[PDB]
Amino acid sequence: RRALRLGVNGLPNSLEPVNAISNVGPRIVNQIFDTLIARDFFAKGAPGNAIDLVPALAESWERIDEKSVRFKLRQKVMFHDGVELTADDVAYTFSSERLWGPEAIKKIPLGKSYSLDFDEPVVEDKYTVTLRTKTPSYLIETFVASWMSRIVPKEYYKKLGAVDFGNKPVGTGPYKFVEFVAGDRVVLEANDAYWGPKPTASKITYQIVAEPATRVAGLISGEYDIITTLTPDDIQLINSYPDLETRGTLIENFHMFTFNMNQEVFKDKKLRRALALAVNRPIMVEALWKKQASIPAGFNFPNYGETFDPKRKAMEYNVEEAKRLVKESGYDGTPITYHTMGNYYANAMPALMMMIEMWKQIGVNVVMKTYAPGSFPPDNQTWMRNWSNGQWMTDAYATIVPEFGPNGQVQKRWGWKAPAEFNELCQKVTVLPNGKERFDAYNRMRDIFEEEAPAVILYQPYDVYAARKDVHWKPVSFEMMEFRNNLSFG
Numbered sequence: 006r007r008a009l010r011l012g013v014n015g016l017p018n019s020l021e022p023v024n025a026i027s028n029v030g031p032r033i034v035n036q037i038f039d040t041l042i043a044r045d046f047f048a049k050g051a052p053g054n055a056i057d058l059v060p061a062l063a064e065s066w067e068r069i070d071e072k073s074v075r076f077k078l079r080q081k082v083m084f085h086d087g088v089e090l091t092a093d094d095v096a097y098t099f100s101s102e103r104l105w106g107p108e109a110i111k112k113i114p115l116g117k118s119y120s121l122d123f124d125e126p127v128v129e130d131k132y133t134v135t136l137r138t139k140t141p142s143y144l145i146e147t148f149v150a151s152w153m154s155r156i157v158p159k160e161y162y163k164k165l166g167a168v169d170f171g172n173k174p175v176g177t178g179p180y181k182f183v184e185f186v187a188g189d190r191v192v193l194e195a196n197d198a199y200w201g202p203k204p205t206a207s208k209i210t211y212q213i214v215a216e217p218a219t220r221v222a223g224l225i226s227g228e229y230d231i232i233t234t235l236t237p238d239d240i241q242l243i244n245s246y247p248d249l250e251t252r253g254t255l256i257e258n259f260h261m262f263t264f265n266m267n268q269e270v271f272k273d274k275k276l277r278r279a280l281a282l283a284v285n286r287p288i289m290v291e292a293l294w295k296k297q298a299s300i301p302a303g304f305n306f307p308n309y310g311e312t313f314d315p316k317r318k319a320m321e322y323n324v325e326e327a328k329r330l331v332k333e334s335g336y337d338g339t340p341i342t343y344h345t346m347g348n349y350y351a352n353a354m355p356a357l358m359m360m361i362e363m364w365k366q367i368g369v370n371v372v373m374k375t376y377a378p379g380s381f382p383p384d385n386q387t388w389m390r391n392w393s394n395g396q397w398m399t400d401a402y403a404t405i406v407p408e409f410g411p412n413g414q415v416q417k418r419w420g421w422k423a424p425a426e427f428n429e430l431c432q433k434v435t436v437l438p439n440g441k442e443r444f445d446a447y448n449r450m451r452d453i454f455e456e457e458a459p460a461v462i463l464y465q466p467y468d469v470y471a472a473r474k475d476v477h478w479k480p481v482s483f484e485m486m487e488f489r490n491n492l493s494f495g
């Protein structure tokens with residue numbers, strides 16, 4: 006076969022599937038690992054956005070009650086080291102020890118905050134395991150199809166520890182691990198024992214090319230087969246080449262900017278709300294995205310299904326109100342830093358430049374502070390910063406509760422003093438079934454989020470890739486790359 010060469014925007018700090026949840030991690034861990042349930046993005050001729058759930062490591066599954074789903078596992082599946090996958094590896098994957106228990110915080114910092122209210126799994130036999138929650142939860146199924154639920158080998162994982170495992174991953178996926186050089190590359194090779202639609206590449210290299218211009222020059226050279234994290238501003242040049250083309254889709258993710266609310270200037274919602282009210286998203290969508298970005302009506306997305314509100318109003322744009330709020334705040338005109346890891350997010354630096362001018366017009370002075378990967382300063386040294394959230398469930402629970410809820414990093418690490426009402430509705434939605442009460446609680450949470458402005462939603466980016474026309478691969482509507490039945494050459 007042919008070795009696949011990818012020019013990427015970045016690499017994760019770990020290949021441990023939960024510690025790799027990011028914009029740059031899933032495109033690699035999707036190859037090394039498998040989930041029990043998988044999403045079939047290409048079902049019924051869909052352009053990589055189908056929401057269909059198909060069996061993967063679990064040949065079948067059945068909800069027993071409001072707290073548990075029994076999985077019947079595929080037999081003779083092998084981990085990359087020849088160890089057979091059993092219900093024991095599945096129990097360990099979702100165990101208190103490895104993922105949601107108090108001890109797990111040390112190994113997987115965000116594991117507990119991103120997990121459901123789990124109870125210990127029950128192994129029925131070598132190929133049957135029941136995944137359980139201590140309280141009623143109809144979210145088990147979407148969680149098991151997610152980036153939180155890639156299956157790890159119990160013995161090898163325990164032998165190495167979560168940290169050492171992140172540097173030498175072992176999974177059941179189509180590509181086995183070969184090498185990980187931090188700040189340089191990840192090399193994978195075909196797992197010809199995949200259970201499993203056969204890998205079509207002999208090797209895959211994820212090479213960091215932090216500058217998008219060097220990434221485009223690389224594809225034209227051509228040092229790469231496919232490049233990631235481009236901007237619609239690159240579309241005309243790449244598409245003029247006869248052997249090159251762009252492939253892009255709107256993904257189930259939103260770009261945003263957030264604050265360190267532990268800082269004096271961001272303790273009260275007034276200056277956060279003023280900055281949010283001056284963000285002119287429609288011009289940013291023209292200037293930078295060429296109409297290829299979607300401004301959502303709040304923390305509300307179609308993939309939420311029954312908890313998506315299609316009648317919700319757009320987020321407010323009000324420069325006069327923003328001006329008044331800056332005057333009403335204790336802000337004195339002192340510069341505020343906004344940290345960004347270059348263009349890790351597409352259009353991050355041109356978006357900040359545009360917003361800096363919008364903010365200067367309402368009386369706020371924002372300065373760009375750029376930083377290299379691995380050099381993010383202590384929390385204490387940061388004020389504003391960009392971020393993104395992948396909506397990883399077919400429900401509104403993610404990501405408002407895992408990220409912005411009472412037990413999340415935005416309140417616990419970044420200092421958001423959320424109102425009591427916001428945290429009460431977070432608990433209610435987690436345990437209430439779908440209905441009038443749960444739909445309304447999410448809307449009231451969305452209304453609270455906009456007034457509080459702990460983060461400011463910008464848009465759903467159109468994820469732009471560029472590839473050699475002789476590399477047949479289609480983007481999916483998520484921050485990952487899929488090669489199963491979606492990769493061929495010539």
Ligand SMILES: CC(C)[C@H](O)[C@@H](O)C(=O)NP(=O)(O)O[C@@H]1C[C@H](O)[C@H](n2cnc3c(NP(=O)(O)O[C@@H]4[C@@H](O)[C@H](O)[C@@H](CO)O[C@H]4O)ncnc32)O1
Pocket residue numbers: 018026027028029258346349379381392393394395396404408484
């Ligand atoms: C281990 C330490 C001892 C060590 O020194 C070092 O590793 C360190 O500094 N660690 P620290 O904790 O300070 O991590 C730093 C702190 C800072 O906030 C930054 N950051 C966090 N999420 C990031 C991200 N998310 P993303 O947008 O690509 O991916 C998101 C993901 O964050 C999110 O959880 C998920 C679901 O909403 O959506 C993805 O889209 N993209 C780029 N930067 C990110 O990394």
